[PDB]
Design a protein around this ligand. Structure first.
Ligand SMILES: [Mg+2]
Ligand SMILES: [Mg+2]
Ligand SMILES: [Mg+2]
Ligand SMILES: [Mg+2]
Ligand SMILES: [Mg+2]
Ligand SMILES: [Mg+2]
Ligand SMILES: [Mg+2]
Ligand SMILES: [Mg+2]
Ligand SMILES: [Mg+2]
Ligand SMILES: [Mg+2]
Length: 224
RNA sequence: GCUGUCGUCAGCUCGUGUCGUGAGAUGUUGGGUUAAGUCCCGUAACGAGCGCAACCCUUGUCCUUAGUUACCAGCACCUCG
C-alpha cells in the first residue's frame, strides 16, 4: 500500500545475520549494519496477491482463522480479528485444535454450558469458594478457547503472524490440507505456507498494519 | 468364595491426537507448594477413569424439642433420705 508507509513503520527489518535461514535468500535485499534487510520491492506484489486471494475467498461464507499469540501481540489481534467474524486465537496455541477437533468440541460445549450458567442470573448463588472456583475455571477456558466458540466446522483458510513461533499450527494445517497465509521473517522457514508474505515481526506497527489490511480486505471481499 | 502382605504407600491406566520402521514414548516431563498425580503457571497434547480428598461413625462448643424409672435451683412438708 503506497510503499513509503510500511517503509516508515517497521517492515524493512530482519532478525540480525547470525540467526538467519538461507531458504529465503531470494527475499533479502542485502544485509547492512549487521542486520538483514528484506527486499521491500518484492514483498508488496505477493502481499497484494494474498490480499486479493483472501478477499475473493471470503465471499461464500468462508471463515479464516487467525493466530497471533506472542509477547504483547495477541492483544491487538483480539480486536482486529473481532468484528467481520474471523475466529481467532490469542493465547498459547494448544496443539490439537485441528487434527483433534473432535476432542475440542467437548471443551467448547462445556465452556458454553459454564458461561450460560454464569450469565443465566448468577446460578452460582452458593458458597463463595465454589463460585470463585467456577469463575476462574470459566475465565481460563475463555482465555484458551475464546475465538473458537463459533465455527463448528473446520476453517478453510488460516493466517499466521510469525510462522516460526507457531510451527505446530502450520504442521496441523498441512496435515489437514488447508491453505495458510503467513508473515515470514528472515530467520523463519518459507515452506509449508501457501501464500507467503516476507515481512517483519516484533514491530507493533507492522502487525497492526497487516491486521488492518486483511480486516478491511475481508470486509470489502464479503460484500456479496 | 473368603483372607494376609507390599501398604493406607500415592500411585495405576484408557480414548482421540502426535512422534518413532518398530518394541514403545508423550500426556503422567519443568519450576514451586502440599499428607496427597493436592493445587498454580508453563507445556503436542486435549480429555476421562480407578485411586487422594469429600459424603459415614464417635468426641470436643452452643440452640430448640422432652422430662420417666432421670435431675433438684426455688417454695413447702420434713421422720432430715
Ligand atoms: Mg507412525
Ligand atoms: Mg524411551
Ligand atoms: Mg514409560
Ligand atoms: Mg520411560
Ligand atoms: Mg500409550
Ligand atoms: Mg497414547
Ligand atoms: Mg506413572
Ligand atoms: Mg509414560
Ligand atoms: Mg487426582
Ligand atoms: Mg478417602
Amino acid at each position: 500500500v503506497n510503499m513509503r508507509d510500511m517503509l516508515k513503520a517497521g517492515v524493512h527489518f530482519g532478525h540480525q545475520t547470525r540467526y538467519w535461514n538461507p531458504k529465503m535468500g531470494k527475499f533479502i535485499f542485502g544485509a547492512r549494519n549487521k542486520i538483514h534487510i528484506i527486499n521491500l520491492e518484492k514483498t508488496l506484489p505477493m502481499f497484494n496477491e494474498a490480499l486479493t486471494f483472501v478477499e475473493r475467498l471470503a465471499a461464500g461464507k468462508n471463515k479464516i482463522l487467525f493466530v497471533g499469540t506472542k509477547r504483547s501481540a495477541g492483544k491487538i489481534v483480539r480486536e482486529e480479528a473481532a468484528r467481520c467474524g474471523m475466529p481467532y486465537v490469542d493465547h498459547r496455541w494448544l496443539g490439537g485444535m485441528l487434527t483433534n477437533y473432535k476432542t475440542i468440541r467437548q471443551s467448547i460445549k462445556r465452556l458454553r454450558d459454564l458461561e450460560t450458567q454464569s450469565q443465566d442470573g448468577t446460578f452460582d448463588k452458593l458458597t463463595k469458594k465454589e463460585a470463585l472456583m467456577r469463575s476462574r475455571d470459566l475465565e481460563k477456558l475463555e482465555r484458551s478457547l475464546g475465538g473458537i466458540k463459533d465455527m463448528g466446522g473446520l476453517p478453510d483458510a488460516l493466517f499466521v503472524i510469525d510462522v516460526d513461533h507457531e510451527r505446530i499450527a502450520i504442521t496441523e494445517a498441512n496435515k489437514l490440507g488447508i491453505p495458510v497465509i503467513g508473515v515470514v521473517d528472515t530467520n523463519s522457514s518459507p515452506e509449508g505456507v501457501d501464500y507467503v508474505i516476507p515481512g517483519n515481526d516484533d514491530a507493533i506497527r507492522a502487525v497492526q498494519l497487516y491486521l488492518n489490511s486483511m480486516a478491511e480486505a475481508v470486509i470489502r471481499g464479503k460484500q456479496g
